Amino acid sequence: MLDKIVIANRGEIALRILRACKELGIKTVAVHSSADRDLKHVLLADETVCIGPAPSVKSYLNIPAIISAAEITGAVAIHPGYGFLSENANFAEQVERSGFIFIGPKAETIRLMGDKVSAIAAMKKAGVPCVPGSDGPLGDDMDKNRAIAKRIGYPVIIKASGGGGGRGMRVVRGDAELAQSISMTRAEAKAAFSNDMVYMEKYLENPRHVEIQVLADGQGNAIYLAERDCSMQRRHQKVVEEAPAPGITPELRRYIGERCAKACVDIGYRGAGTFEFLFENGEFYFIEMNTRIQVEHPVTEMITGVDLIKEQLRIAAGQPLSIKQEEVHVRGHAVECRINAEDPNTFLPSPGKITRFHAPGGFGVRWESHIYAGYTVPPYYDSMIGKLICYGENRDVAIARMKNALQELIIDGIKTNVDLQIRIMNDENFQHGGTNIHYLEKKLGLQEK
């Protein structure tokens, strides 16, 4: 067992990791910035280390500072969580060679899977279905690009293979702007992810975002938990998840779980990861793999009883998988609604000071956040200020509990996206279950006279 690890993150996920560590009896090391000196998990930790000033580049993206903090405190492992250095393969390599243990996949698999084109090629090599497309970054020949697009079928989309975070991808409607769109997408990928590689893939109009969480110890063991569904996306970023998904009968669930387990075995995967897909009339299309603890992890714990962070801490400690395929039981349903400090409509972040805070509480309500009375939201990082789950017995029960909790939930002093959450809950199609990915955008509408 890892005697003492480092919370290489901040905020909600930092607090969650801290709670899990204190549960498992593992001591805590808190690394923070100078602005986040009153974080909940920072105050609830034995050892607090400040490794930079307010900006992210100088403080949390400062890999030398994190390794220095892990050296001075005597840790033997580091947990990145999600975001920041979650998928930095070089970070994994340095931590492995620095003398500590990286809680996550080996850096080789990070390189192979983070780059989208390589991940798709490997998935096709393992037999996992993928979107037909270029299967390689295209050049400056418009004729080749349009020929490939006609081969796969318009419309088409250009996405940065080293891209992520809901940016660095542009959709192409026709050849009248294909070259310019590809060039500007390459420029954006250069400006964001330090890579110019951009590829072409078939674009769908009516998809259903289906993703499967999986676990593997890298020793020939691969287990898959229940599915997920994030149909309510805004700007390609999730706002309301749910797990398991409607319509996915256990036959298809087992059928795709076996394939994902075989893929993990073939790649020799380690740690907690999820294989995203695209669902339509029984067809799945892998597009990306997130080799980290996904943010919408709770909607899988509550429907299976298995703590993901405990699984990661045990796997990183070298212990084999303590849970087998038949020992995973899917019992229930869940809904999750993130809370962000942005503007409800204009989507402008609204940092400041929180005046009144009050958790929902109740049967099946699980409120993951670090905000508290007087906590000053820093204008320096992501706008997320908490997650919220309402585990029910069926989807309708979960929706009702979420409505009740949102009525109970009170956050005052800054702008919050609770109103949009209430509107989403009240929607009939959403309550029915099975809406398309763009459903949110159709409900968004457009300009007016």
């Binding site: 100078s34 280390v49 400040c50 490794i51 930079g52 000033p53 030398p64 500072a65 390794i67 220095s68 903090a69 050296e71 001075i72």
Partner: protein, 77 residues
Amino acid sequence: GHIVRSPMVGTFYRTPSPDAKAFIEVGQKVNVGDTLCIVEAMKMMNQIEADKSGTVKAILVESGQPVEFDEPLVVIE
């Protein structure tokens, strides 16, 4: 007055060598350009330089005690 703070996080020392003399002394004044202490990180002993001249009012740190960013080390009046 002005207090020097380590810009990095790591082990703190006062003598650059295991058996040597400390860079500065309490009392006797120091100038803008001078090295005052060592904040070692990853076995790479780096130097700490003040920015204002004045009398060494007091030393607020002790050898071998790790410090971090924005940590007042020595006050200079």
